[PDB]
Amino acid sequence: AKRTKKVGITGKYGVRYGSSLRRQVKKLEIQQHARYDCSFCGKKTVKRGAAGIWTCSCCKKTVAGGAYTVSTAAAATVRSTIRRLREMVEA
Amino acid sequence: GRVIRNQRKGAGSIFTSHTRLRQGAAKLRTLDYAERHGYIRGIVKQIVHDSGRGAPLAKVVFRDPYKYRLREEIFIANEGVHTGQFIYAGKKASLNVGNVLPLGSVPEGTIVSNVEEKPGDRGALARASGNYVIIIGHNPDENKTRVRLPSGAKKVISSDARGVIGVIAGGGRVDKPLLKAGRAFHKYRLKRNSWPKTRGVAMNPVDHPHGGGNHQHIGKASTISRGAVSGQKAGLIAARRTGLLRGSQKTQ
Amino acid sequence: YATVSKTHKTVSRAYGGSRCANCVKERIIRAFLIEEQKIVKKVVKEQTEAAK
Amino acid sequence: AKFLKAGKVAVVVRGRYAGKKVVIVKPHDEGSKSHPFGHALVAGIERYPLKVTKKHGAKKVAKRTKIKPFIKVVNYNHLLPTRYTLDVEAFKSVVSTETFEQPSQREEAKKVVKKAFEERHQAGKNQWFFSKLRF
Amino acid sequence: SINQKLALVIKSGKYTLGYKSTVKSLRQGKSKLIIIAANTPVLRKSELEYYAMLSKTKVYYFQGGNNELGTAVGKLFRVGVVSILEAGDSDILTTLA
Amino acid sequence: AREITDIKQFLELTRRADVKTATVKINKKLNKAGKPFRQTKFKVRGSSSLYTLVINDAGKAKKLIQSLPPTLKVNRL
RNA sequence: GAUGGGGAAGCUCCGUUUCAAAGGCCUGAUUUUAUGCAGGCCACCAUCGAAAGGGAAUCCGGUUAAGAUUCCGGAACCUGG
RNA sequence: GCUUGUGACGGCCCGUGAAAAUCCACAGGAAGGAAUAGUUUUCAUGCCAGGUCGUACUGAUAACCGCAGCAGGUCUCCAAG
RNA sequence: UCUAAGGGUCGGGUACGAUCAACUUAGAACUGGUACGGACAAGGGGAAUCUGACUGUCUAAUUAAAACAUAGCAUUGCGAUGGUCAGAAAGUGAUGUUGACGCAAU
RNA sequence: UUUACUUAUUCAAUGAAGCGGAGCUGGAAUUCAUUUUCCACGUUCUAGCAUUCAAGGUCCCAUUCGGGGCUGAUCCGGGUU
Ligand SMILES: [Mg+2]
Ligand SMILES: [Mg+2]
Ligand SMILES: [Mg+2]
Ligand SMILES: [Mg+2]
Ligand SMILES: [Mg+2]
Ligand SMILES: [Mg+2]
Ligand SMILES: [Mg+2]
Ligand SMILES: [Mg+2]
Ligand SMILES: [Mg+2]
Ligand SMILES: [Mg+2]
Ligand SMILES: [Mg+2]
Ligand SMILES: [Mg+2]
Ligand SMILES: [Mg+2]
Ligand SMILES: [Mg+2]
Ligand SMILES: [Mg+2]
Ligand SMILES: [Mg+2]
Ligand SMILES: [Mg+2]
Ligand SMILES: [Mg+2]
Ligand SMILES: [Mg+2]
Ligand SMILES: [Mg+2]
Ligand SMILES: [Mg+2]
Ligand SMILES: [Mg+2]
Ligand SMILES: [Mg+2]
Ligand SMILES: [Mg+2]
Ligand SMILES: [Mg+2]
Ligand SMILES: [Mg+2]
Ligand SMILES: [Mg+2]
Ligand SMILES: [Mg+2]
Ligand SMILES: [Mg+2]
Ligand SMILES: [Mg+2]
Ligand SMILES: [Mg+2]
Ligand SMILES: [Mg+2]
Ligand SMILES: [Mg+2]
Ligand SMILES: [Mg+2]
Ligand SMILES: [Mg+2]
Ligand SMILES: [Mg+2]
Ligand SMILES: [Mg+2]
Ligand SMILES: [Mg+2]
Ligand SMILES: [Mg+2]
Ligand SMILES: [Mg+2]
Ligand SMILES: [Zn+2]
């Protein structure tokens, strides 16, 4: 029973702030509230709470991550970059 | 007339910081014997929110080399570090996210955070959520190491200046529209009494260079000299250009 | 708690009224293995020193 | 191999003798009308011989190297089988099903195992066994 | 490939899934080969590894977490360890493993 | 602040150095569902607690009453 | 907000662990004896600042012209020794 | 049902929502301890002591502030059909 | 003044019975000086122009507004031997438990 | 004018803990008589454990229980870095 045609979670803000700002928020909102896969125990049970802090329900691990998403593009590539450079040092 | 606002901030009364809830001060370990001859292990015991800070802190605990006790440090959490992870601090440490190493011991392109300006100052450069620095040079004689800061500026500092592998966590925080006035309100409530902001141009002359007139207007160039004097410097201070920045920025 | 007999302030396992048992199962195994693998680590490289 | 056999050393991993080391002496690999689980009759040590040093003279050494033992029926699922091993001859017959049931029979069992464990420790046979696991 | 072997085992042999039962299997010299998930923690890893060496039981470090190790054995849940006690028509025991 | 039931234990209180006073209370109560019966409560005033022993039994009560220390300072009713 | 300090012609201003030789506990050594030395520690550096924050422990019945979780009655509980 | 208390949950945050005194516990094993009799007061019972100041009443269309027994102002708990 | 629908609790070898307690909603008769949210309680509505986006703010005691704020947008300064600001001075101070996803100034 | 020096002056750090110089061992190194040097010179699967001048070894007290040197842990300069 599809309730809204496009606001979704953003329905809470009614008419205020102007469509476009509500789009932008809706994005990161969806991103931030969503349940994520735990690298460690492998269940999807990582939720947010305070920007950058991502902590896993059962299993109880906490990972520092992006302000509204577990892993951030930049961070990620930096990881891969650090792979590459580390390689250089025992090869 | 009267003392303007931006000179009252200086006596710090209502303008001092709202410190009551903060975890403490983020700093690297002291540059002791271990960290500067070999390395030293720790455990991130907890990563945690700091009121008025973007990025989370990581509580990281170490053994005392000289006494039987635990000594706890307060780190700024690089993205990806997790509770229970082992953190390695030292010249002879290995290059993975979380560990802290002297800019000398990490090759070109290493991406690091919370870096010192002089060795030992326990962390100065790139600490805000998202920011980092990248090593771009080394000069083996007089051990400098060249870096690019988040501002684009490039600086050179001691090769012994410590940094931590990776980028500060919580990035992206500012892509989110604040949406409403109160979300700023609570933001600044846990920072300092800097918000909201009356435009000088809405004040009277007693109040401001910009105040007064029968219409609101600045009445003279709003770009003010460095040699200006307190009570004068409101506007665009020492502004060397002005107007809509067209075309790609980004330092050469 | 100073108005109460000591049995109200522990269980009788090691690390009684302090750590949650499942948690002491844990530190026991870790302790054991790591101390073992420690003997393993030293004889691997005691050999390496004489095999190079 | 079916490692839970007579000689086996294992650290207990639950319950008051938690973290202390034992020896299996008799295994009941599966079953009992009671004890409905794979379980062993073990005789660990409860109060370890304290460290002894040069300074330690005469009857301090006597004092320090006294072991308090103990004997347990115990679930397999609570032992951590060890690579080490210790002989069980001097108390093959002291540690028994029959030994438990009737306390006074247990006290006697421990009595022996104690003299058997202190004998072993002096003239340092099975050296690992007589030293606290820390955690 | 390694997965294809596992699958043959699953459809022609005897296995047990999970941490506790592959210990029943390990204590009882019943296991021929255990297969261990990528992300299953190192204490578990170490403890199975120790249990194994005592039963003279060779081990396989499955590159790929418990999520897939489950799909490996064609189950809709996750598994962190497998214990082969009877290899079916498959040769896993006496191949690369 | 205390109840007691071992008729033996009781007697031991009544001769316990610091037990000067004591009192006996009589209560008409009913039995089960039908009739009534003479309950009696034995209260010994120790120094830091007032022990009270209830003898539901009329018989046991009277034989208990004469058991009391001839030096105890019993309050009847 | 004192203090070693640093400014100020000076009333005083700055600093609060700060470029300071910053202090005190546990018992042992006494069996001239009352307490010197013998260890080992611990280096926390004033102090004021809440009758709504934190915080050892009490209740019912009765009683006065006017007091009561405060008296009386009974029954408790806490801290120290 | 009503008011209040409380639990296990769930929403929210670029906000993630004090401190210290004080109390206990554990890891440690210094050391002190029995058979002619030793250890034990975190079990019970038993003994003594608990100072100083406040404590009435009003708290408001008359006990407070508004020149006053002023239609103004002035923090809060309990709450029947 | 009637009718119907919506529940609890028990024993059943390895279809139902028995009993206790609840206002809700809908339907139908009858009835009156056509009254009935019977007092109390309780939105006037519609079409446009100007103007500020909104919620929020101020001239205590003649102005509540279109004024201020605000999110949003844009510009300026600064890598700490620093930017902005305090102080008669200082081994002085605010930002700063801070570091450009930052602080400061329009 | 340039560019060296460190003791004035200046900045940072630390309950001024491991500096500077030599030496041991290893070893890359290639020997143009033999060493001419350069790097090293106890820790990285694991959310354990690491404290009593340290166990050990060795010398002393006049053998008591206790206890002390040395070594374990290399030398030299007292510039906290
Ligand atoms: Mg402040
Ligand atoms: Mg304000
Ligand atoms: Mg503005
Ligand atoms: Mg404004
Ligand atoms: Mg105006
Ligand atoms: Mg002016
Ligand atoms: Mg002007
Ligand atoms: Mg003007
Ligand atoms: Mg204008
Ligand atoms: Mg208990
Ligand atoms: Mg113990
Ligand atoms: Mg002062
Ligand atoms: Mg006070
Ligand atoms: Mg108070
Ligand atoms: Mg209070
Ligand atoms: Mg009363
Ligand atoms: Mg009176
Ligand atoms: Mg009264
Ligand atoms: Mg009284
Ligand atoms: Mg009394
Ligand atoms: Mg007492
Ligand atoms: Mg209320
Ligand atoms: Mg919370
Ligand atoms: Mg407790
Ligand atoms: Mg001693
Ligand atoms: Mg007591
Ligand atoms: Mg006194
Ligand atoms: Mg009163
Ligand atoms: Mg009155
Ligand atoms: Mg009035
Ligand atoms: Mg019905
Ligand atoms: Mg009809
Ligand atoms: Mg408006
Ligand atoms: Mg409005
Ligand atoms: Mg007005
Ligand atoms: Mg006026
Ligand atoms: Mg208005
Ligand atoms: Mg616009
Ligand atoms: Mg000065
Ligand atoms: Mg130093
Ligand atoms: Zn998890």
3-state secondary structure string, chain D? CCCCCCCEEEEECCCCCCCCEEEEEEEECCCCCCCCCCEEEECCEEECCCCCCCCCCCHHHHHHCCCEECCEEEEHHHEEEEEEECCCHHHCCCCCCCCCCCHHHHHHHHHHHHHHHHHHHCCCCCHHHHCCCCC
Chain C, 1-40: which have a CB under 8 Å from a chain E CB? 26, 29-30, 33-34, 36-37
Q: How many CB atoms lie within 10 A of CB D65?
A: 17
Q: Which of residues 3-42 of C touch strand G (CB under 7 A)?
A: 3
| C-beta of residue B156 within 8 angstroms of C-beta of residue B146 | yes
Phi, psi of D112 (to 5 degrees): -65, -55
Report the C-alpha gap between B87 and B83 in whole angstroms.
10
Report the C-alpha gap between B120 and B128 in whole angstroms.
20
| C-beta of residue F52 within 8 angstroms of C-beta of residue F3 | yes
| C-beta of residue B178 within 8 angstroms of C-beta of residue B196 | no
Per CB-CB distance under 8 Å, the chain E contacts of C30 are 43
Report the C-alpha gap between E82 and C44 in whole angstroms.
29
Report the C-alpha gap between E76 and B168 in whole angstroms.
38
- Look up residue E93 and give its DSSP letter: G
Report the C-alpha gap between C42 and A22 in whole angstroms.
62
Q: Which of residues 2-41 of F touch strand G (CB under 7 A)?
A: 2
How does DSSP assign E30-68, residue by residue? --SEEEE-SSS-HHHHHHHHHHHHHTT--EEE-SS-HHH
| C-beta of residue B171 within 8 angstroms of C-beta of residue A66 | yes
Distance B68 CA to J67 C1' (A): 27
**Measured at the alpha carbon of residue E56, what is the angle toward residues E55 and E57, in degrees to the nearest 5?**
90
Report the C-alpha gap between D22 and D46 in whole angstroms.
9
Q: How many CB atoms lie within 10 A of CB D123?
A: 6
User: Which CATH code for domain E1-97?
Assistant: 3.30.1330.30
Shortest-distance nucleotide from B83 CA to C1': J47
User: How far is ligand 29, taken at its centre, from the CA of residue B106, in Å?
Assistant: 83
User: How far is ligand 26, taken at its centre, from the CA of residue C5, in Å?
Assistant: 8
Shortest-distance nucleotide from F43 CA to C1': G75
**Partners of F30 in the beta sheet?**
F36
Q: For chain C, how many helices (H) and strands (E)?
A: 1, 0
Q: Is the dihedral of CA C35, C37, C41, C47 positive or negative?
A: positive
Report the DSSP pairing between strands F21-30 and F73-76: parallel
| C-beta of residue E9 within 8 angstroms of C-beta of residue E92 | yes
| C-beta of residue D69 within 8 angstroms of C-beta of residue D43 | yes
Q: What is the amino acid identity at position D135?
A: F
Residue B126 tokens, joined:
């790139």
Longest dimension (CA), chain A: 60
A44-47 β-sheet, strand order: A36-37, A44-47, A53-56, A62-64
Q: Do E54 and D3 touch (CB under 8 A)?
A: yes
Report the C-alpha gap between B170 and B191 in whole angstroms.
18
Q: How was this structure determined?
A: X-ray
Interface test with E, best of A38, A39, A41, A58 (most E CBs within 10 A): A41
Report the C-alpha gap between B123 and B131 in whole angstroms.
14
Report the C-alpha gap between D71 and D95 in whole angstroms.
8
Provide the 3-class DSSP secondary structure of residue F63. Answer: helix
Q: What is the amino acid identity at position B143?
A: N
Phi, psi of B154 (to 5 degrees): -110, 130
Q: How many CA atoms lie within 13 A of B206 on its CB side?
A: 1
Report the C-alpha gap between D89 and D6 in whole angstroms.
10
Q: Is the dihedral of CA A64, A69, A75, A79 positive or negative?
A: positive
Report the C-alpha gap between B55 and B69 in whole angstroms.
29
**Partners of B155 in the beta sheet?**
B147
Chains F and C, touching by 3 or more CB pairs within 8 angstroms: no
Report the C-alpha gap between F64 and F60 in whole angstroms.
6
Partner chains of C (3+ C-beta pairs under 8 Å): D, E
From residue B42, alpha-carbon distances to B59, B77, B99, D38 in Å are: 10, 14, 9, 41
B130–chain A Cβ distance below 8 A for any pair = yes
Q: How many CB atoms lie within 10 A of CB B73?
A: 21
Report the C-alpha gap between F21 and E97 in whole angstroms.
88
Q: How many CB atoms lie within 10 A of CB B11?
A: 9
Distance B203 CA to I65 C1' (A): 18
Report the C-alpha gap between B209 and B199 in whole angstroms.
11
* Tokens 């005392």, residue located: B64
**Partners of D72 in the beta sheet?**
D42
Q: Do D83 and E53 touch (CB under 8 A)?
A: yes
**Measured at the alpha carbon of residue E8, what is the angle toward residues E7 and E9, in degrees to the nearest 5?**
90
From residue B196, alpha-carbon distances to B181, B183, B185, B209, B229 in Å are: 9, 12, 8, 19, 25
E59-61 β-sheet, strand order: E14-17, E81-86, E33-36, E59-61
Q: Is D37 exposed, middle or buried (0-12, 13-18, 19+ CB in 10 A)?
A: middle
From residue D82, alpha-carbon distances to A6, B204, D4, D9, E54 in Å are: 63, 86, 10, 5, 8
* Total residue length of chain B: 252
Q: How many CA atoms lie within 13 A of A65 on its CB side?
A: 24
Domain edges within chain E: 1-97
Report the C-alpha gap between E45 and E51 in whole angstroms.
10
- Look up residue C39 and give its DSSP letter: H
* Total residue length of chain C: 52
